[PDB]
Design an enzyme around this catalytic site. Structure first.
Site, mmCIF file in Angstrom:
data_model
loop_
_atom_site.group_PDB
_atom_site.id
_atom_site.type_symbol
_atom_site.label_atom_id
_atom_site.label_comp_id
_atom_site.label_asym_id
_atom_site.label_seq_id
_atom_site.Cartn_x
_atom_site.Cartn_y
_atom_site.Cartn_z
ATOM 1 N N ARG A 13 2.037 11.263 1.306
ATOM 2 C CA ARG A 13 2.965 10.297 0.447
ATOM 3 C C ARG A 13 3.330 10.669 -0.858
ATOM 4 O O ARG A 13 2.261 11.109 -1.468
ATOM 5 C CB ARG A 13 2.118 8.939 0.393
ATOM 6 C CG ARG A 13 2.257 8.272 1.770
ATOM 7 C CD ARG A 13 1.715 6.721 1.689
ATOM 8 N NE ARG A 13 0.243 6.437 1.131
ATOM 9 C CZ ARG A 13 -0.899 6.298 1.950
ATOM 10 N NH1 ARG A 13 -0.657 5.951 2.964
ATOM 11 N NH2 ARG A 13 -1.961 6.198 1.055
ATOM 12 N N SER A 109 7.003 3.655 4.891
ATOM 13 C CA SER A 109 6.199 2.485 5.261
ATOM 14 C C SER A 109 6.677 1.094 4.412
ATOM 15 O O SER A 109 7.732 0.734 4.381
ATOM 16 C CB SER A 109 4.752 2.930 5.372
ATOM 17 O OG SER A 109 3.859 1.608 5.486
ATOM 18 N N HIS A 110 5.454 0.490 3.740
ATOM 19 C CA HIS A 110 5.795 -0.763 3.060
ATOM 20 C C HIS A 110 6.159 -0.762 1.644
ATOM 21 O O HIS A 110 6.224 -1.580 0.826
ATOM 22 C CB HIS A 110 4.463 -1.658 3.309
ATOM 23 C CG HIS A 110 3.309 -1.363 2.411
ATOM 24 N ND1 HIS A 110 2.441 -0.076 2.852
ATOM 25 C CD2 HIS A 110 2.819 -1.525 1.217
ATOM 26 C CE1 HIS A 110 1.618 0.086 1.959
ATOM 27 N NE2 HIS A 110 1.715 -0.862 0.986
ATOM 28 N N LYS A 119 4.179 10.958 8.535
ATOM 29 C CA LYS A 119 2.919 10.141 9.316
ATOM 30 C C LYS A 119 2.932 11.361 10.550
ATOM 31 O O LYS A 119 4.006 11.563 11.078
ATOM 32 C CB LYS A 119 3.251 8.789 9.902
ATOM 33 C CG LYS A 119 3.003 7.725 8.987
ATOM 34 C CD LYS A 119 3.353 6.262 9.152
ATOM 35 C CE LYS A 119 2.794 5.428 8.251
ATOM 36 N NZ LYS A 119 3.018 3.993 8.464
ATOM 37 N N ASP A 243 6.746 -4.537 8.768
ATOM 38 C CA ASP A 243 6.680 -3.967 7.735
ATOM 39 C C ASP A 243 7.722 -2.794 7.716
ATOM 40 O O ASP A 243 8.638 -2.925 8.787
ATOM 41 C CB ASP A 243 5.422 -3.320 7.655
ATOM 42 C CG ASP A 243 4.979 -2.036 8.458
ATOM 43 O OD1 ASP A 243 5.627 -1.841 9.393
ATOM 44 O OD2 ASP A 243 4.002 -1.369 8.030
ATOM 45 N N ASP A 245 8.261 0.204 8.503
ATOM 46 C CA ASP A 245 8.479 1.334 9.386
ATOM 47 C C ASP A 245 8.244 0.733 10.954
ATOM 48 O O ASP A 245 8.416 1.402 11.867
ATOM 49 C CB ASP A 245 7.894 2.517 9.416
ATOM 50 C CG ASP A 245 6.391 2.515 9.272
ATOM 51 O OD1 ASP A 245 5.886 1.472 9.189
ATOM 52 O OD2 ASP A 245 5.581 3.522 9.462
ATOM 53 N N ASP A 247 5.490 -0.371 12.462
ATOM 54 C CA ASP A 247 4.009 -0.171 13.008
ATOM 55 C C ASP A 247 3.142 -1.379 12.706
ATOM 56 O O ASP A 247 1.938 -1.476 13.159
ATOM 57 C CB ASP A 247 3.347 1.174 12.816
ATOM 58 C CG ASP A 247 2.972 1.338 11.486
ATOM 59 O OD1 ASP A 247 3.239 0.502 10.599
ATOM 60 O OD2 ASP A 247 2.407 2.359 11.040
ATOM 61 N N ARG A 248 3.679 -2.398 12.031
ATOM 62 C CA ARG A 248 2.873 -3.704 11.808
ATOM 63 C C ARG A 248 3.556 -5.011 11.873
ATOM 64 O O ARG A 248 5.008 -4.972 11.425
ATOM 65 C CB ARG A 248 2.400 -3.733 10.293
ATOM 66 C CG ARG A 248 1.244 -2.580 10.023
ATOM 67 C CD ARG A 248 0.338 -2.771 8.598
ATOM 68 N NE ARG A 248 1.223 -2.430 7.514
ATOM 69 C CZ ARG A 248 1.186 -2.614 6.292
ATOM 70 N NH1 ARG A 248 0.039 -3.144 5.835
ATOM 71 N NH2 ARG A 248 2.003 -2.348 5.140
ATOM 72 N N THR A 307 -12.604 0.791 9.267
ATOM 73 C CA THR A 307 -11.171 0.749 8.846
ATOM 74 C C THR A 307 -10.570 1.970 8.525
ATOM 75 O O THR A 307 -11.117 2.879 8.161
ATOM 76 C CB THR A 307 -11.076 -0.148 7.567
ATOM 77 O OG1 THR A 307 -12.095 -1.164 7.671
ATOM 78 C CG2 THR A 307 -9.666 -0.687 7.174
ATOM 79 N N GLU A 326 -6.782 -4.013 13.661
ATOM 80 C CA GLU A 326 -7.436 -3.732 12.491
ATOM 81 C C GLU A 326 -6.924 -5.059 11.602
ATOM 82 O O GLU A 326 -5.812 -5.448 11.755
ATOM 83 C CB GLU A 326 -7.284 -2.738 11.783
ATOM 84 C CG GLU A 326 -7.276 -1.335 12.504
ATOM 85 C CD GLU A 326 -6.617 -0.246 11.620
ATOM 86 O OE1 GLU A 326 -5.459 0.023 11.675
ATOM 87 O OE2 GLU A 326 -7.212 0.322 10.689
ATOM 88 N N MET A 327 -7.792 -5.553 10.691
ATOM 89 C CA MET A 327 -7.238 -6.676 9.929
ATOM 90 C C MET A 327 -5.923 -6.497 9.206
ATOM 91 O O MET A 327 -5.013 -7.226 9.344
ATOM 92 C CB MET A 327 -8.316 -6.779 8.937
ATOM 93 C CG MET A 327 -8.125 -8.333 8.090
ATOM 94 S SD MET A 327 -8.109 -9.538 9.407
ATOM 95 C CE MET A 327 -7.934 -10.829 8.352
ATOM 96 N N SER A 328 -5.664 -4.984 8.694
ATOM 97 C CA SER A 328 -4.403 -4.625 8.356
ATOM 98 C C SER A 328 -3.028 -4.792 9.161
ATOM 99 O O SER A 328 -1.858 -4.746 8.539
ATOM 100 C CB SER A 328 -4.298 -3.229 7.708
ATOM 101 O OG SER A 328 -4.231 -2.643 9.054
ATOM 102 N N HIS A 330 -2.364 -3.450 12.382
ATOM 103 C CA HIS A 330 -2.028 -2.607 13.306
ATOM 104 C C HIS A 330 -2.659 -2.897 14.863
ATOM 105 O O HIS A 330 -3.923 -3.147 14.540
ATOM 106 C CB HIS A 330 -2.338 -0.969 13.000
ATOM 107 C CG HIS A 330 -1.835 -0.315 11.920
ATOM 108 N ND1 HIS A 330 -0.908 0.360 11.755
ATOM 109 C CD2 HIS A 330 -2.134 -0.701 10.488
ATOM 110 C CE1 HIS A 330 -0.515 0.754 10.545
ATOM 111 N NE2 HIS A 330 -1.117 0.224 9.626
HETATM 112 ZN ZN ZN Z 1 4.072 0.785 8.708
#
Ligand code: ZN
Length: 458
Positions: A13, A109-110, A119, A243, A245, A247-248, A307, A326-328, A330
């Site tokens: 990133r 991403s976000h 990625k 988000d 891209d 993936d969430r 995590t 996961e909490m995030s 995904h």
């Molecule tokens: Zn993402």
């Protein structure tokens, strides 16, 4: 000259015009293509999100891969899990079917408009830590393979949509609010949910890499205020927010309640376990105390893990489990799927379940719940002082797979190290307000003993 700081734990990133440019993308493509050939691979899928720097960087990346002697299959601008999907299935290329199991998605991403990144999936593995530092080292060292790979553009969207639609048939149509924050999720997510038969109230589903409305970052509740208002003002039943891209997935009820991904995972685990009795369900140490009991009562085996999306993925591949989350936010379906995290697929799987009831919001709200604190900032050094010397009054166990997860009869405390930020992260959950307070009080006194003199955030 390339900066080591863009090579993070789980990806790469950087900020356009400061640490990231075409030269940087090209060296990263050359380094990654070199590792593909050293493992005997000869091809890589590339994709991008809808950022302004996207077209230039994915072109430079492709040049670098091809200079290493690797063929490039360019699937164009698609959500991140669509690039994963292209690296998972046979591709009907014009020269004949071909299977390509590495990919790089250029995406920020976000993050704000000027951020971007990569990625990376190398032969099915989401590479992290030392394997990513090894790309930086090939660049510093100019240690590269050489060749002249081919280039081809391939649209994988129709295969993706048809693959999901042919396995998921909704009980009834459901009217949805879909908020993409002008990110790459909007076009294909709207296409997908229309294909499943849903009517949509769209928010910011056109691509605009300036993000002129709200960042596509459902992790901040302020970025959900449009979906909440739209659910009050229309007859839509459920709100989905992606988000940048894809993936969430964020999920909001009719009455404005955010359903955190540890609660989402309970609902998925129940349905998955109903077809897979005894299966493991993986989740991370930030998730509700309620998951363990839920998964057991539903006939599965809970597996609490570290995590980090790539660590959860590695654990899924090690165990063969049907589901992780996961909490995030995904969520990884291997059951009926390919085992990569995918916000658009999770959305479809959630609609499959929600469509069986007349009131999806009552179903979601009635999932087990508890009181909690937000995340708190205080790394590595103090976490070890704590582990060896802390008298946590009344705890059942101190769990150490990732930081210190302290489990009490009525809740849990977590102190751990981040894997980007250089400071210690805390969170608390309990079965009542007073129990939340006693738990903190307990952590408070332990942190006063461990790092005496420091200013705590609680
Ligand atoms: Zn993402």
């Amino acid at each position: 000259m390339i900066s080591q700081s863009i090579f993070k734990a789980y990806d790469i990133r950087g900020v356009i015009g400061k640490t990231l440019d075409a030269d940087v993308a090209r060296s990263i493509g050359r380094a990654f293509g070199s590792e593909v050939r050293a493992q005997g691979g000869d091809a890589v899928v590339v994709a991008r999100d809808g950022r302004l720097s996207g077209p230039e960087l994915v072109g430079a990346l492709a040049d670098g891969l091809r200079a290493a002697g690797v063929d490039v299959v360019d699937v164009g601008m698609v959500p991140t899990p669509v690039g994963y999907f292209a690296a998972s299935v046979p591709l009907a290329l014009s020269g004949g079917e071909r299977r390509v199991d590495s990919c790089i998605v250029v995406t920020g991403s976000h993050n704000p408009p000027d951020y971007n990144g990569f990625k990376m999936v190398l032969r099915g593995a989401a590479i992290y830590g030392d394997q990513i530092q090894g790309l930086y080292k090939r660049i510093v060292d100019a240690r590269f393979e050489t060749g002249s790979g081919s280039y081809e553009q391939y649209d994988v969207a129709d295969q993706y949509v048809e693959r999901i639609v042919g396995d998921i048939k909704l009980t009834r149509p459901l009217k949805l609010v879909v908020d993409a924050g002008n990110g790459v999720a909007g076009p294909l997510a709207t296409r997908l949910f229309k294909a499943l038969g849903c009517e949509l109230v769209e928010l910011f589903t056109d691509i605009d890499g300036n993000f002129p409305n709200h960042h596509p970052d459902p992790a901040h509740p302020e970025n959900l205020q449009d979906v909440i208002a739209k659910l009050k003002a229309t007859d839509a039943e459920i709100g989905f927010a992606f988000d940048g891209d894809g993936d969430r997935l964020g999920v909001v009820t009719k009455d404005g309640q955010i359903i955190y991904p540890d609660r989402q995972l309970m609902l998925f685990a129940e349905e998955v376990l109903s077809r897979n009795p005894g299966a493991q369900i993986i989740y991370d140490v930030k998730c509700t105390r309620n998951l363990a009991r839920w998964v057991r009562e539903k006939g599965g085996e809970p597996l609490m893990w570290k995590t980090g999306h790539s660590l959860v993925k590695a654990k899924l591949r090690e165990t063969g489990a049907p589901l992780a989350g996961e909490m995030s936010g995904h969520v990884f379906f291997k059951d009926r799927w390919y085992g990569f995290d995918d916000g658009l697929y999770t959305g479809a799987r959630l609609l499959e379940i929600l469509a069986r009831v007349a009131d999806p919001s009552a179903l979601l709200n009635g999932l087990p719940n508890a009181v909690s604190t937000p995340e708190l900032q205080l790394n590595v050094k103090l976490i070890d002082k704590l582990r060896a010397d802390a008298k946590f009054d009344g705890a059942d166990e101190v769990v150490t797979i990732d930081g210190l997860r302290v489990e009490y009869p009525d809740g849990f405390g977590l102190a751990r190290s981040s894997n980007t930020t250089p400071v210690v992260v805390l969170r608390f959950e309990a079965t009542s307000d007073a129990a939340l307070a006693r738990i903190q009080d307990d952590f408070r006194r332990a942190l006063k003993a461990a790092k005496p003199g420091a200013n705590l955030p609680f």
